[PDB]
Coordinates of C-alpha atoms in Angstrom, one line a residue:
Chain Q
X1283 CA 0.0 0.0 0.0
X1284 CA 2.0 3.1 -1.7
X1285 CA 1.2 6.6 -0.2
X1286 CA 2.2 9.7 -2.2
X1287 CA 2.3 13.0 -1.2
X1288 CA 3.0 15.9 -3.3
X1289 CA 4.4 19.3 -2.2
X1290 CA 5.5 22.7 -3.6
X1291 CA 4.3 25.6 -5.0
X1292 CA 0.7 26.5 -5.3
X1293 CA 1.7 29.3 -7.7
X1294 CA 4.4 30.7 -10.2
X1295 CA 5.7 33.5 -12.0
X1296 CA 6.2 33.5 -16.2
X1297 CA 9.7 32.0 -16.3
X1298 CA 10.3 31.2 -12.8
X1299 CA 11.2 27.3 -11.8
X1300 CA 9.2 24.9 -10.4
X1301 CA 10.5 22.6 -7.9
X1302 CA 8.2 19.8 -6.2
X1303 CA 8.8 17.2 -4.0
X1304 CA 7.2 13.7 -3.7
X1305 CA 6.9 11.9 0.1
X1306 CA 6.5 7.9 -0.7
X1307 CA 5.2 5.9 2.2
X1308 CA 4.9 2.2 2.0
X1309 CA 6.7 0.1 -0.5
X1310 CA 9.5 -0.2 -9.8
X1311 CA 9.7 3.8 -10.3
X1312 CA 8.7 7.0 -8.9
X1313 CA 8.0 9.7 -11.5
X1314 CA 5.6 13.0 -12.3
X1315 CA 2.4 13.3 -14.5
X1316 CA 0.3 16.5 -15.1
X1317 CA -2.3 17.4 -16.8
X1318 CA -3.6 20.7 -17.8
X1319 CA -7.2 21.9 -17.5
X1320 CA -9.4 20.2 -20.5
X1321 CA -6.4 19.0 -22.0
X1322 CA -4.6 15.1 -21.7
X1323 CA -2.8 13.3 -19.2
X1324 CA 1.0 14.4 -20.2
X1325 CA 3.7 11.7 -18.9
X1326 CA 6.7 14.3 -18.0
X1327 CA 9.2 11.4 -16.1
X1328 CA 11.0 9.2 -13.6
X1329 CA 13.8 7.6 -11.3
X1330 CA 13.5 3.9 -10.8
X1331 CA 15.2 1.8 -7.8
X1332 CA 18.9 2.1 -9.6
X1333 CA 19.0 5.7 -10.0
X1334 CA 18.3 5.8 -13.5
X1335 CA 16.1 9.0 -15.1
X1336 CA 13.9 9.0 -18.3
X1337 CA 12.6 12.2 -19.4
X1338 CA 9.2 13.1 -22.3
X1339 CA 11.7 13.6 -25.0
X1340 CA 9.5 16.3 -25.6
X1341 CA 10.4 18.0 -22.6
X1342 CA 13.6 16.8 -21.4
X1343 CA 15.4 19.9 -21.6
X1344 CA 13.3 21.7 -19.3
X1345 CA 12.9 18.8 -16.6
X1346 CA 15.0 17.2 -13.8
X1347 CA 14.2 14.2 -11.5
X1348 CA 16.2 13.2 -8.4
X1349 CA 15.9 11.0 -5.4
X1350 CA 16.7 10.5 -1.6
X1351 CA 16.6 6.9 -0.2
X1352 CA 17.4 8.1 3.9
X1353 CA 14.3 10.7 3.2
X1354 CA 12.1 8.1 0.2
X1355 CA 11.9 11.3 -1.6
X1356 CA 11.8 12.0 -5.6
X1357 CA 11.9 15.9 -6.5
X1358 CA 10.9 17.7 -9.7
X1359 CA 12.3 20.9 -11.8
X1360 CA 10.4 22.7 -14.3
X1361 CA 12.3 26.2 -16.2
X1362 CA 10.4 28.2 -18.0
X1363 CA 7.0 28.0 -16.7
X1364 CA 4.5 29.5 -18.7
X1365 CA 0.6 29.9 -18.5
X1366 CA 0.7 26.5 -20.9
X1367 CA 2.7 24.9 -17.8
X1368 CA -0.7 25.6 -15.2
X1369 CA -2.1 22.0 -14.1
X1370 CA -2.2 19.3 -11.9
X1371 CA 0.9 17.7 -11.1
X1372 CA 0.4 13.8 -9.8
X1373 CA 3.1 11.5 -8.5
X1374 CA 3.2 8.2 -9.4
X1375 CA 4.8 5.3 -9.2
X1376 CA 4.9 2.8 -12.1
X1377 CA 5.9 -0.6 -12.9
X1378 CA 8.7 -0.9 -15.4
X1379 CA 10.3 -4.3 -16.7
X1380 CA 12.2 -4.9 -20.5
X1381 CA 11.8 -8.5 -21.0
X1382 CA 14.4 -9.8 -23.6
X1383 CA 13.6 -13.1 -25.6
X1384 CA 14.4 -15.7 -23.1
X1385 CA 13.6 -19.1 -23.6
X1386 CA 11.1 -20.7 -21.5
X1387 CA 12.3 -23.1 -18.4
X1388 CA 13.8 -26.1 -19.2
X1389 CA 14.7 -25.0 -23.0
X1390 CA 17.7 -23.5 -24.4
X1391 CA 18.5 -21.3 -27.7
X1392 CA 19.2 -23.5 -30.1
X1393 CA 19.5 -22.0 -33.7
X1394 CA 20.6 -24.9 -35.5
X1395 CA 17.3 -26.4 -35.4
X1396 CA 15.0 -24.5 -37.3
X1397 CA 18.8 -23.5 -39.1
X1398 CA 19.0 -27.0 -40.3
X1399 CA 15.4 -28.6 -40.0
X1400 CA 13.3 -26.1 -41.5
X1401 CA 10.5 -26.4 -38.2
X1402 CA 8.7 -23.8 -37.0
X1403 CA 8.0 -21.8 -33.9
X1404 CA 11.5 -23.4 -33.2
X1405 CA 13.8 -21.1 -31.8
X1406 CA 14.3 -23.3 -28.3
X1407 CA 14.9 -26.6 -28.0
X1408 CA 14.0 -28.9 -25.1
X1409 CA 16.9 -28.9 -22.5
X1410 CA 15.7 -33.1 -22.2
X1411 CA 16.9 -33.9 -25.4
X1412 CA 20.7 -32.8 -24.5
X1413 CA 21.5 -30.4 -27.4
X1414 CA 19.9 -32.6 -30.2
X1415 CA 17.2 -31.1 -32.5
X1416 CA 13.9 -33.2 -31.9
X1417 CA 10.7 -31.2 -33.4
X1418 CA 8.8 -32.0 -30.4
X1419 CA 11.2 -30.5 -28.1
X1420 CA 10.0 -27.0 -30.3
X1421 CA 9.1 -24.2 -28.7
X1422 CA 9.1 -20.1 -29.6
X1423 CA 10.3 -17.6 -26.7
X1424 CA 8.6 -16.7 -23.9
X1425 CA 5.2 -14.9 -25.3
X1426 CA 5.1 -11.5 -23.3
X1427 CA 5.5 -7.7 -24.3
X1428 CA 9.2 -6.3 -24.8
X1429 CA 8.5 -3.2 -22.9
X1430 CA 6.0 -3.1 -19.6
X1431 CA 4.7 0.3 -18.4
X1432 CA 2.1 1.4 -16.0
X1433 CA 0.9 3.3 -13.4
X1434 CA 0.4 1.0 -10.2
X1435 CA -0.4 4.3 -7.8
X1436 CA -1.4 7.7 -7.9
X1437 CA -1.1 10.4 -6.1
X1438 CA -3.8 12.8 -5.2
X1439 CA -2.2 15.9 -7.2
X1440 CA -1.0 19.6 -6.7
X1441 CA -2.8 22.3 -8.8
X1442 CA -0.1 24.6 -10.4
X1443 CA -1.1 28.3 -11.2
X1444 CA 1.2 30.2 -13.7
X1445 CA 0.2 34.2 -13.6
X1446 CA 1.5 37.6 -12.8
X1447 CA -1.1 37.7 -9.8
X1448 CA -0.1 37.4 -6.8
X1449 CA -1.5 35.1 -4.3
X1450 CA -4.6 36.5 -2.1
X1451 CA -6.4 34.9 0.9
X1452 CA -10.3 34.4 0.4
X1453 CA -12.9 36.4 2.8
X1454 CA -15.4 34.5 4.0
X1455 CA -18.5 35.6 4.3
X1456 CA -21.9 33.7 6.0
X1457 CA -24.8 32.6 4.4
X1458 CA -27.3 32.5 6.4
X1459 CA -30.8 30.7 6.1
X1460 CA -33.6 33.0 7.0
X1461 CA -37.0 32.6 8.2
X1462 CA -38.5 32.1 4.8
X1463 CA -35.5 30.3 3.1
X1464 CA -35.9 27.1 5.2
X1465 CA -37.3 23.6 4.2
X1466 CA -39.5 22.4 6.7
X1467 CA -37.4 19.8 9.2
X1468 CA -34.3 21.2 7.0
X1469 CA -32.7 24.4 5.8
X1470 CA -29.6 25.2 3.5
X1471 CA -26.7 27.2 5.1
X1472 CA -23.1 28.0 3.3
X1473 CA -20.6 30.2 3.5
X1474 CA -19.4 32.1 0.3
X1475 CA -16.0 32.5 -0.1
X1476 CA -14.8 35.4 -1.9
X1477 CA -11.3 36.7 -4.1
X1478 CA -9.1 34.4 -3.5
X1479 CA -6.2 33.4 -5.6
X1480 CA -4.9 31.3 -7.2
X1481 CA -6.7 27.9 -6.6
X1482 CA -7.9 25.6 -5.0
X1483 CA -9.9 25.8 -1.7
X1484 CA -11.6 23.1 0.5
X1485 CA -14.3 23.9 2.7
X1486 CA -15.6 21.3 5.2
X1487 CA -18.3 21.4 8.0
X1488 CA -17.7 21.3 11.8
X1489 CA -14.5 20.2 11.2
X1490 CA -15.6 17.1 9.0
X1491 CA -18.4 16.2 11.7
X1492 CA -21.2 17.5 9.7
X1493 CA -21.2 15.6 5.8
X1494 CA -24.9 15.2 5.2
X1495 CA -25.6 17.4 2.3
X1496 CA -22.5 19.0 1.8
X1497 CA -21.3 20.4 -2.0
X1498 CA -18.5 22.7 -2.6
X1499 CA -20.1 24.0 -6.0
X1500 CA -17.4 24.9 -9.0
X1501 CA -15.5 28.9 -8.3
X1502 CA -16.2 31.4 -10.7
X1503 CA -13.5 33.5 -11.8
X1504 CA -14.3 37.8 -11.8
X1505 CA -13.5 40.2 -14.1
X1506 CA -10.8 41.0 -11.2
X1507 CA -8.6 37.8 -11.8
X1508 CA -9.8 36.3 -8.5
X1509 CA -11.5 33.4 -7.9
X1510 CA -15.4 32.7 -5.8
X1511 CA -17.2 29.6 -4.9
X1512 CA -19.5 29.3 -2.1
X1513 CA -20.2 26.0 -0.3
X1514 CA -23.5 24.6 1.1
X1515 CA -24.9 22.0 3.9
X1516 CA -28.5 21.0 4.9
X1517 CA -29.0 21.4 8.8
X1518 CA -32.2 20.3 10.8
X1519 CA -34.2 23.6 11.0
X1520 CA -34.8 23.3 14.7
X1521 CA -31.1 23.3 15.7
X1522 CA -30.6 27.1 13.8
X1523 CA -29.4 29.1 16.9
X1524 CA -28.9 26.4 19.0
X1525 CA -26.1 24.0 17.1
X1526 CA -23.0 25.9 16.3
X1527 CA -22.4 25.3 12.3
X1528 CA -18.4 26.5 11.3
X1529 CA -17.1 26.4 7.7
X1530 CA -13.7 25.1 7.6
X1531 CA -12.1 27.3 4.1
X1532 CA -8.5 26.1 3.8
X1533 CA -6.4 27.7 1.6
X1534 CA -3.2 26.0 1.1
X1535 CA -2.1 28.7 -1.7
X1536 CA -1.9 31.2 1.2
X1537 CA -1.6 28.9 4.1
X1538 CA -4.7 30.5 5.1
X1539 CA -7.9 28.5 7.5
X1540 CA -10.9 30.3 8.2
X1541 CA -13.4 29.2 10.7
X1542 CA -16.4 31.3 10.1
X1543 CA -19.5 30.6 12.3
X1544 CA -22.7 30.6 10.5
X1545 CA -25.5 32.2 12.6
X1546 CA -29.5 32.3 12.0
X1547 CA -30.6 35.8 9.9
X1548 CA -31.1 38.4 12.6
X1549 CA -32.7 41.9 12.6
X1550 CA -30.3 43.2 15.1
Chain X
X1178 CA 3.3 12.0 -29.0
X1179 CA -0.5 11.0 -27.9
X1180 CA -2.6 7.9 -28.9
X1181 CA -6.0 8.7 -30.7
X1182 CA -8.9 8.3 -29.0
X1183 CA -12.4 9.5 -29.5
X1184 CA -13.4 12.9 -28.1
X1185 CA -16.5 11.5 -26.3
X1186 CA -18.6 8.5 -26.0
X1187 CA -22.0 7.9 -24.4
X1188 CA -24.5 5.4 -23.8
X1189 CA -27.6 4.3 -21.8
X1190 CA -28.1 2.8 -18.5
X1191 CA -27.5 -1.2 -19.0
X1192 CA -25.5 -0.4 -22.6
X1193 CA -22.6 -0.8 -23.6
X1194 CA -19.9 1.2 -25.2
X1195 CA -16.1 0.8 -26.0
X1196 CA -13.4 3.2 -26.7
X1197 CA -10.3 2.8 -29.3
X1198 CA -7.0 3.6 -28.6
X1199 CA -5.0 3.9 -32.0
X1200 CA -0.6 4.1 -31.9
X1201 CA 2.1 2.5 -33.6
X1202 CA 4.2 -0.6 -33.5
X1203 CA 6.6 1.3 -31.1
X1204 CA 3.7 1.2 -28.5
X1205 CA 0.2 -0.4 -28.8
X1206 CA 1.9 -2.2 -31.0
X1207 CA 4.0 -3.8 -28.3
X1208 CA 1.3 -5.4 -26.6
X1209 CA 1.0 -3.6 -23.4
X1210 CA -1.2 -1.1 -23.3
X1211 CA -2.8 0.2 -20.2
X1212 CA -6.5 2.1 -19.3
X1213 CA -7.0 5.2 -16.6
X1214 CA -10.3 6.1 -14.8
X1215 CA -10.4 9.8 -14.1
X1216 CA -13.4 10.9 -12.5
X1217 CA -13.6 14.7 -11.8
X1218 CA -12.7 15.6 -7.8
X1219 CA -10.9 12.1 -7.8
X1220 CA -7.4 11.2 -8.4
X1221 CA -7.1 8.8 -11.4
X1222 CA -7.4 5.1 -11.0
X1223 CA -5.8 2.5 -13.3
X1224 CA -8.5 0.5 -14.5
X1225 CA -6.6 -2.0 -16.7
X1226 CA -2.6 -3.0 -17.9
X1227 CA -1.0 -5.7 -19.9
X1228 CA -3.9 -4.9 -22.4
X1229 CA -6.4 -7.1 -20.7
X1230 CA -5.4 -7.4 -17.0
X1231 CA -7.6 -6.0 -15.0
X1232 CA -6.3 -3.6 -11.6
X1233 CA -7.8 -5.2 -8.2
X1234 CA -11.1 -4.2 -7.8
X1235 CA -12.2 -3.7 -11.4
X1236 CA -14.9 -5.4 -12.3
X1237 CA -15.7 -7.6 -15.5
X1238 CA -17.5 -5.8 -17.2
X1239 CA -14.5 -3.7 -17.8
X1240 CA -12.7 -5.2 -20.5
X1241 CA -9.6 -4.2 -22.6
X1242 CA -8.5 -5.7 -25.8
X1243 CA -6.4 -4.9 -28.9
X1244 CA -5.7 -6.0 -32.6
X1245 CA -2.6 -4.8 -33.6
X1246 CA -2.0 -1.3 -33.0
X1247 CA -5.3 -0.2 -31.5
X1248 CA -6.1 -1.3 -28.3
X1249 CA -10.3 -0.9 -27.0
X1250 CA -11.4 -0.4 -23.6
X1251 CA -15.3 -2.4 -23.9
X1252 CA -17.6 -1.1 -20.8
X1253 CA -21.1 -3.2 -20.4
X1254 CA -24.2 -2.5 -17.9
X1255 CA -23.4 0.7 -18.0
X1256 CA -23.9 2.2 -14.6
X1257 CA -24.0 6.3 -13.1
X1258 CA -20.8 5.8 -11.1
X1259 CA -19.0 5.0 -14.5
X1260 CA -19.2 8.8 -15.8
X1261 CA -15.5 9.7 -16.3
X1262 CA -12.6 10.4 -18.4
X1263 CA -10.7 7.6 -19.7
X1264 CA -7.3 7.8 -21.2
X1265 CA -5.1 4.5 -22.7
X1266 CA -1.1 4.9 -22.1
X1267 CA 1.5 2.4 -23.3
X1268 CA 5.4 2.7 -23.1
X1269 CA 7.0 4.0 -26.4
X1270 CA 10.0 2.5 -28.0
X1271 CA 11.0 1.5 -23.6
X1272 CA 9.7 0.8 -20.8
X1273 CA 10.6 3.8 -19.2
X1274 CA 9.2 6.3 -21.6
X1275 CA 5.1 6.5 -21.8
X1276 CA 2.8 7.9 -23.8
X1277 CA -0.8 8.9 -23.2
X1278 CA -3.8 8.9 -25.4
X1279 CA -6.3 12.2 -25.6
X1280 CA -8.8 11.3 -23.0
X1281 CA -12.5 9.9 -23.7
X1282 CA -15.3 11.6 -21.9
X1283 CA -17.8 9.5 -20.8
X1284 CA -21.4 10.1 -20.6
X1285 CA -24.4 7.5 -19.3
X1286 CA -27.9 8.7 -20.1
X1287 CA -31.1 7.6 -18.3
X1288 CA -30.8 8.4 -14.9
X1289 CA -33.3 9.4 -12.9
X1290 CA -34.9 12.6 -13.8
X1291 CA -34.9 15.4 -10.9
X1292 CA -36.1 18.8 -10.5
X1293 CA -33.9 21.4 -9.2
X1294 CA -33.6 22.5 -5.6
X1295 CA -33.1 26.3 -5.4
X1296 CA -31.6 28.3 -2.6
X1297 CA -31.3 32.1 -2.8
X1298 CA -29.3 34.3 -0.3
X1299 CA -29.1 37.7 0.2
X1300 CA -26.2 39.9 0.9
X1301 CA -24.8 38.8 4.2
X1302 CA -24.4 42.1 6.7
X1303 CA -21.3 41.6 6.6
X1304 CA -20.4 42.0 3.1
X1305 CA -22.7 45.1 3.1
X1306 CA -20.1 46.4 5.7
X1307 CA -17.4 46.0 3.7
X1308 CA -18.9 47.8 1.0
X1309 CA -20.1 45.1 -1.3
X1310 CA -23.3 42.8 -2.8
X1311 CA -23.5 39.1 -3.6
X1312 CA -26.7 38.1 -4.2
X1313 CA -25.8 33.8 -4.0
X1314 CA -28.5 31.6 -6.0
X1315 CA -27.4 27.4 -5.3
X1316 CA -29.0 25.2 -7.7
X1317 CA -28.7 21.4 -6.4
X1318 CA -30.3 18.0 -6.7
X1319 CA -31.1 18.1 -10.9
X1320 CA -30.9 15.6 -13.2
X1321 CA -30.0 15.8 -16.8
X1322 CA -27.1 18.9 -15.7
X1323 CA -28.3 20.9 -17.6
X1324 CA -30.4 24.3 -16.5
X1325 CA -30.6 28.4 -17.5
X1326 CA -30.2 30.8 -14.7
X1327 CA -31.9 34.4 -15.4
X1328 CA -32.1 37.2 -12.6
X1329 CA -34.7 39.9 -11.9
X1330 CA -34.3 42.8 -10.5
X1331 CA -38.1 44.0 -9.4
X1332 CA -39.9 42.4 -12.2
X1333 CA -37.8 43.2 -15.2
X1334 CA -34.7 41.2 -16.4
X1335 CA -31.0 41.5 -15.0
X1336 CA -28.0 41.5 -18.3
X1337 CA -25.3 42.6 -16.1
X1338 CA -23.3 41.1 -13.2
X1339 CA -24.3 37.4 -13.7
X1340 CA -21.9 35.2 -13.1
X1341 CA -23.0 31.3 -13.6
X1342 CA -21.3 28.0 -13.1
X1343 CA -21.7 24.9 -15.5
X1344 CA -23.3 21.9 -13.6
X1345 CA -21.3 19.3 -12.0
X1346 CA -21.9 16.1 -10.1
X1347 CA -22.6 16.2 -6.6
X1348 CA -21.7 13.0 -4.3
X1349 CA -25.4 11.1 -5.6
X1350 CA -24.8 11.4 -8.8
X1351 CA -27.1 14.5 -9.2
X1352 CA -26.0 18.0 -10.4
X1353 CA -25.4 21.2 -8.8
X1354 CA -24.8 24.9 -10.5
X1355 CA -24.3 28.2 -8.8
X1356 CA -25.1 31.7 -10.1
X1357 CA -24.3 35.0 -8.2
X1358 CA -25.2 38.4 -9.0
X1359 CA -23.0 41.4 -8.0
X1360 CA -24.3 44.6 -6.7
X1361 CA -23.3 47.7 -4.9
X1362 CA -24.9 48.2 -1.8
X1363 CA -26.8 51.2 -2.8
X1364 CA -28.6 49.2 -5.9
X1365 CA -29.2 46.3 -3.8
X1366 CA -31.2 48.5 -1.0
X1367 CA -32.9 50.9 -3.8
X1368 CA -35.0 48.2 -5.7
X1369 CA -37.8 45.8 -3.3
X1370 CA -36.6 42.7 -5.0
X1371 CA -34.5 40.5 -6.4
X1372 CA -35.3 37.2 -7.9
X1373 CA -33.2 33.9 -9.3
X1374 CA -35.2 32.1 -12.1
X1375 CA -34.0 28.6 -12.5
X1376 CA -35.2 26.5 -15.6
X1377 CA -35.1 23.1 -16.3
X1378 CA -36.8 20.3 -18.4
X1379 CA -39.1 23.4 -19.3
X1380 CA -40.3 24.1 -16.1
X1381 CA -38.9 26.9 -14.0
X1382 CA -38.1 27.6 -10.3
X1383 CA -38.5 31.3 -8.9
X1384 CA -36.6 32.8 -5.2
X1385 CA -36.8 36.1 -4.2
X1386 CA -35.2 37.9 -1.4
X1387 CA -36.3 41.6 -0.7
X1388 CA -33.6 44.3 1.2
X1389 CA -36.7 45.0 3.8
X1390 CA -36.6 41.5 4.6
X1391 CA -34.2 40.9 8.1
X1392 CA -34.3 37.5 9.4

């Protein structure tokens, strides 16, 4: 059971250098994938057990893969960011193997059989018949692919802003259900959360106690450059004033949390 | 370099549907070929490798195959759950160097239908403090995603300040949009209402919130 953890930047500046980092927990090769908003799944590389780095070719020049066994860490280097560099960046780790033709168990290479015979699906001969060519002591190589690739874990992904913006912490702001708004035993309250940048943000409930309901809905991004998205969560209508209800906005691009309390529509 | 695939494929509940995956010898060709789940909110999940083995937990009905250098991914009994993008990836020329294809978007139709559940907020006091107006209109709980959003302001239409999210799945397989309309505080207290129209399947879904209205 692999674990991976990405960290580094939730934002960059045209031309500036990315640098991430992969934690692996649990116990092949480690290596990067990204993909862009709307766009495909872009392999970029990786460093297997031996040290050994493979690069897109695509890319190459701009990328750089390295690893630490005392702290079972991989890292990643990105020049030149540009706005075409902005997307999620996922750790994997992938199984590799290059199988050559071997001959199966209990059957050696033996050329001179088909070379001399004329049999088919020849190429190894049966180790029982000592080195002689007997047709049914035949057999072709091992059948398997030359090259095996895959990705055997994933990682949950870093979002990647390139912009001249800088970062921004959201404000939070309540929104609360009012006397008219509510629906019967239950009643929607959120909190909207307001020019931020870049992205993402997370909003829970009561710390995670409170699920029923919840939906962080999609942000919208202003005419200002900054992003809003407001999140909702259905509460029994007779606990409004009575139940404390908390939205939990974590920004990690600003390494902001906001707790904002959520109280019943007053007419103070 | 990127395998073909399709742009999009859909089908109904209990169908099935398969996607191609198109290279060259250097890569489908070589026999290994492997498929990626990528549901949106989710990490992706490998679905299949080896061409036709299938990732623990998979089940059959997820099938991969391949004839020469185009590999298929065949999904059967279609269920909601199974909405995603799918992508095929091989190794190229290595088994170190991997190539992905351009992504399939799945779509299953025939789910339950579902009217839309419509919440409309007012400016919070607090924003008003600070100078500023978000009318907040959450549209949840619809099925097919698809709805239009239109705003009033007293009883004649609202152009400006709309800003509207596209639908996208909520935890049950429903959808859920958001629309917000930005004021300045003076506008928002000199008019006696403001309403969020919400259409869908033809039928539409009216809130209104007045500034006289505290609690």
């Amino acid at each position: 059971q692999v674990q991976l953890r990405e960290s580094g930047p939730s934002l960059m500046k045209p031309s500036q250098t990315l640098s991430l980092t992969c934690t692996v927990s649990g116990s092949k090769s480690v290596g990067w994938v990204r993909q862009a908003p709307g766009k495909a799944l872009q392999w970029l590389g990786s460093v297997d057990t031996s040290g050994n780095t493979d690069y897109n070719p695509g890319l190459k020049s701009r990328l750089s893969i390295t690893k630490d066994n005392s702290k079972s860490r991989i890292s990643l280097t990105v020049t030149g960011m540009t706005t075409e560099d902005s997307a999620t960046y996922y750790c994997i780790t992938a199984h590799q193997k290059t199988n050559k033709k071997e001959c199966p168990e209990d059957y050696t290479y033996n050329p001179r059989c088909p070379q001399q015979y004329g049999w088919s699906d020849c190429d190894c001969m049966g180790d029982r018949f000592g080195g002689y060519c007997r047709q049914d002591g035949c057999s072709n190589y091992i059948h398997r692919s030359t090259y095996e690739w895959y990705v055997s874990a994933w990682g949950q992904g870093l979002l990647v802003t390139v912009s001249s913006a800088s970062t921004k912490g959201p404000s939070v702001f309540p929104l609360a259900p009012s006397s008219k708004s509510t629906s019967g035993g239950t009643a929607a309250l959120g909190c909207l959360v307001k020019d931020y940048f870049p992205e993402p943000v997370t909003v829970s409930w009561n710390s995670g106690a409170l699920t029923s309901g919840v939906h962080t809905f999609p942000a919208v991004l202003q005419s200002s450059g900054l992003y809003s998205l407001s999140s909702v969560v259905t509460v029994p209508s007779s606990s409004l004033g009575t139940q404390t209800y908390i939205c939990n906005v974590n920004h990690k691009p600003s390494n902001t949390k906001v707790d904002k309390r959520v109280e019943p529509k007053s007419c103070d | 370099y990127e395998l073909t695939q399709p742009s999009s494929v859909s089908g109904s509940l209990g169908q099935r549907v398969s996607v191609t995956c198109s290279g060259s010898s250097s890569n489908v060709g070589n026999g290994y070929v492997s498929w990626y789940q990528l549901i949106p909110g989710s990490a992706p999940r490998t679905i299949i490798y080896g061409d036709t083995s299938r990732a623990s937990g998979v089940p059959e009905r997820f099938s991969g195959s391949r004839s020469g250098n185009t590999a298929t991914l065949t999904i059967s009994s279609l269920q909601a759950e199974d909405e995603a993008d799918f992508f095929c990836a091989s190794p190229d020329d290595s088994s170190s160097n991997a190539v992905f294809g351009s992504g399939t978007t799945l779509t299953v139709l025939g789910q339950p239908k579902s009217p839309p559940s419509v919440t409309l907020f007012p400016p919070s006091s607090e924003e008003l403090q600070a100078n500023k107006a978000t009318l907040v209109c959450l549209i949840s709980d619809f099925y097919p995603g698809a709805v239009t959003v239109a705003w009033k302001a007293d009883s004649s239409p609202v152009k400006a300040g709309v800003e509207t999210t596209t639908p996208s799945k909520q935890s049950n397989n429903k959808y859920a949009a958001s629309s917000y309309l930005s004021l300045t505080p003076e506008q928002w207290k000199s008019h006696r209402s403001y309403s969020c129209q919400v259409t869908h399947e033809g039928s539409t879904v009216e809130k209104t919130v007045a500034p006289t209205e505290c609690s």
